[PDB]
Symmetry: D3
């Protein structure tokens, strides 16, 4: 799944896109996606001026956007719960995020997912995410 | 504590500043800070084009930056653990985030904190955050 | 009037939105709008890098956009044609709220005239008398 | 100039006369940040930003001779014509008085021959006493 | 132009000759995004972006007469002189052949009289067969 | 060579950084660098909004910045003076890695000449012959 199938699948547009390509896809349980970390991205100007590192909260969003792509390839998604999120290794410009998402429930008008992010072949982040589904509440 | 005492206290610079002012401060246990949500911020262009809402991961960063200000008014801080993070109400341009941070441990080369964010006087987010302290590991 | 109406009513989009919501509005006589000043806005990296002040000219645009909301919720690119008695007193910085008051004095003569006073919590910081012009499709 | 991008509005000063007169040229183009949202329908230079080109042409004089000069009074400002990418401003500022900790000037902005705007500006002279002043206001 | 900001490099086409020649003007200023980092020491228009002004002046011809024309060959390109804010490019493009699904042109860029750059460009003509082509490459 | 050396060695800072790291480097003969193409980069919102392609000219700059790393780890604003035999074949999109190979042919004659070939996974997508110039402090 190339980047521009991803664009209309994601409601997010720049500056808040964190998915570049999807390698694997199991229709409603599993997906893996790729995020290229390049020094030319906007967040690296201020985080940090001295040392460029991907913020941990943006890795969670990279987990969440990979979940939304799975969900909307599977027949507004707001992240509502973050549990057991662990951040292990610094993420540097030049790395590729291999973002893994496993589905745990799609039954509570929302979704519990459990995600694992890896650089070349070693884990750098994990989290258990839960979303909520709303559309123009008013 | 006005915005430009905050600037040198925070290692983050735009586009990744989420603290505008600190109202209260207890030297090493408690702080409250303010974040103004304005539609002219860069994240609202792509999140979302149809409906402007503050992402949940950026509220966690607003919690984390309020913790760093407490820590560096108290004699590189990387967020390493997110636990029990709950997101309750949508955050809209025009709202003020009253970010609360309570300190739980500063004893593990890092810090466990437990944060509560509120709009006018009602809770919209909470989280238990844990950081790690590194400086030019090489 | 919340921000999603503000954004559909204003012809200005980012990076030139200076109204976040309206709190009191009465049908072609008087309106009051709120602008949150945030340190994460795009103008503050340049004005100034040394000391972040809301530019005075952009307070005038905030006065202008507030009455465009008033002009247009009242039965087109409204462009500024004249400014008289523009007085600015106190620097407004990130962390402040601008309560923008606009009072109509004369409406369309192919252009409208308004008196506007901007305040921080209740101390006056800017006031001006604005006249706009209504437009072609040249 | 004390400012940088995104809020720099001068490129060249063609004629400099020690203490009372300059002519400056800021020149308009499509890649400036303001035209992305003002307007998406079609690009016009905002009238308030034309006032900056006047104020910045002023402040270049007052410290190329004889250094944050905040905008204090804008009287008799008329915006006769729209400014469009491809055009080139030709800002002339005549100093009228250096009365006290401020200065009154008369500015006229010109495109190739026609006159598109004029204003009468008055500023205020401080650098860093200004901080504690801004501290005392809060 | 198929592009928008931050990658628009034309403002006015002064002379248009149906199928073989234009002269265009992109004009340089300090508020363009490229000069924030090229260079922080002092601002020079990158030579590769001057090639865009040539290529965009070309592509305006080929569809103002007779619509994504990707850059395929850049031969004999010389950058004699630096381009600085305040300057104004004057891009001339002579069409030499519309051979097949592409076009060979000779461009010369001029500041007030002197010549700052020239190049010989060749493009490729597709719109949307280009997607599945890009799909087949992956 | 990781990114923090890349950023101190390159004179180009954002938004004009096009090298993320170097993987093999040998002292004034040959260098190989890596560029991650991400959909969250600033150029892709404008080139194109319809279809995100890495501009060909910025691949040349990536060739140029890679050899500036090579020129400067080998005992100043290196500016592009000539481009010959620039051939571009395949569109490179977000999700791809650019493996930038540069080979020195002649070093400082007040300028250097290099042959550069850029690749995606191993298929060649861009190649050029670059000559730069070393500079004044005009």
């Amino acid at each position: 799944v190339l980047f521009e199938e991803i664009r209309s699948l994601l409601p997010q547009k720049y500056p808040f896109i964190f998915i570049d390509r999807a390698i694997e896809f199991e229709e409603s349980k599993r997906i893996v996606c790729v995020k290229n970390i390049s020094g030319n991205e906007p967040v690296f100007v201020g985080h940090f001026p001295d040392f460029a590192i991907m913020p941990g909260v943006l890795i969670i969003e990279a987990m969440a956007q990979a979940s939304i792509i799975l969900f909307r390839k599977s027949l507004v998604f707001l992240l509502a719960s973050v549990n057991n999120a662990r951040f292990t290794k610094p993420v540097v410009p030049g790395d590729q995020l291999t973002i893994e998402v496993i589905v745990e429930k799609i039954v509570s008008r929302g979704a519990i997912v459990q995600s694992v992010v890896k650089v070349q072949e070693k884990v750098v982040a994990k989290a258990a995410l839960t979303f909520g589904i709303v559309e123009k509440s008013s």
